[PDB]
Each structure stands twice: as structure tokens, then as C-alpha cells.
Ligand binder design. Structure first.
Ligand SMILES: NC(=O)[C@H]1CCCN(C(=O)Cc2ccnc(N)c2)C1
Ligand SMILES: [Zn+2]
Length: 139
């Protein structure tokens, strides 16, 4: 689990969104595994606006942050689960590293701020849903 709180927005993995998230839905994209809901309290997380390919992510299944190199956001094949059939998830970034299903929502960060959140994993590759292109999150 995990979310990004910026302004009056809460950004979570779509497969983990709550009833409250859906009742206060702002935007959702199944092809990106992202959902944004509105909040009453103001959030102060900083979204990175960059092309960084290095960062650090939080891995809850190890209580540790790991430094990784990751690919630029792109369309990648994702095997089916109880949340989705087999499909191509877009705006996804891969890195060599450990993850478990419960790690989804762990933040990936660079020197400029929040890059994205853990969304996919398996066979030693961890995938992050990018949020750096969502300029409206800051307005
Ligand atoms: N974005 C999706 O379609 C995900 C929905 C939930 C299932 N899924 C995963 O990759 C599960 C996962 C995540 C992280 N580490 C792992 N070792 C296994 C795909
Ligand atoms: Zn950066």
C-alpha cells in the first residue's frame, strides 16, 4: 500500500483504490494502474518534473529503500491477476529489484521529488507507474 499527497489530490494504484477514492474520483486510467481522488486536507509532496533514470524506492517487504536505475516510461506486457486480464500497461518504468504484491504504492524518488509508485513486479524486476507527466497535479 501507499499513496502520493500533493495539493488537494491523493494518487494511488487503481487496483488498490478505496470506496472513498471512487466517491471522490478526479481521474483514473486502467491502462496506467493510476487513480487520483480529491482530498480536504492539503498535501505537500513534491512531484519531480525531469527525465531522471536513477532514484530510490521504498520496499515495504524489506523495510528498506533501494537505489535503482530504471527505464524511461513505456508500454510493457503485464500477466493477469484478480485485478486485470493480460494487457499492456503504459507509462511503466522497470528496474532490477525486489518487490512483493503488497509493495504496490511504495514511492520511487529522485533529487527532484516523487517519480512514481510501485505497480508491477516478478522475476526480479519491479515496475513503477510514472506520474511526472501529470502536470495538473500541481494546479
Ligand atoms: N499493475 C498491475 O497490473 C498489477 C496489479 C496487481 C498484480 N500485479 C503484480 O505485478 C503483482 C506484483 C507487484 C509487485 N511485486 C510483485 N512481486 C508482484 C500487476
Ligand atoms: Zn529527477
Amino acid at each position: 500500500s501507499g499513496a502520493i499527497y500533493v495539493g488537494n489530490y491523493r494518487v494511488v494504484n487503481r487496483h488498490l483504490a478505496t470506496h472513498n477514492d471512487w466517491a471522490n474520483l478526479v481521474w483514473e486510467d486502467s491502462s496506467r494502474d493510476l487513480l487520483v481522488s480529491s482530498t480536504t486536507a492539503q498535501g505537500c509532496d513534491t512531484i519531480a518534473r525531469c527525465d531522471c533514470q536513477t532514484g530510490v524506492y521504498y520496499c515495504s517487504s524489506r523495510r528498506k529503500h533501494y537505489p535503482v536505475s530504471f527505464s524511461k516510461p513505456s508500454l510493457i506486457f503485464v500477466e493477469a491477476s484478480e485485478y486485470y486480464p493480460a494487457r499492456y500497461q503504459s507509462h511503466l518504468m522497470l528496474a532490477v529489484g525486489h518487490s512483493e504484491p503488497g509493495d504496490c504504492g511504495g514511492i520511487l524518488r529522485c533529487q527532484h521529488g516523487v517519480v512514481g509508485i510501485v505497480s508491477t513486479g516478478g522475476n526480479g524486476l519491479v515496475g513503477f507507474a510514472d506520474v511526472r507527466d501529470l502536470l495538473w497535479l500541481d494546479e
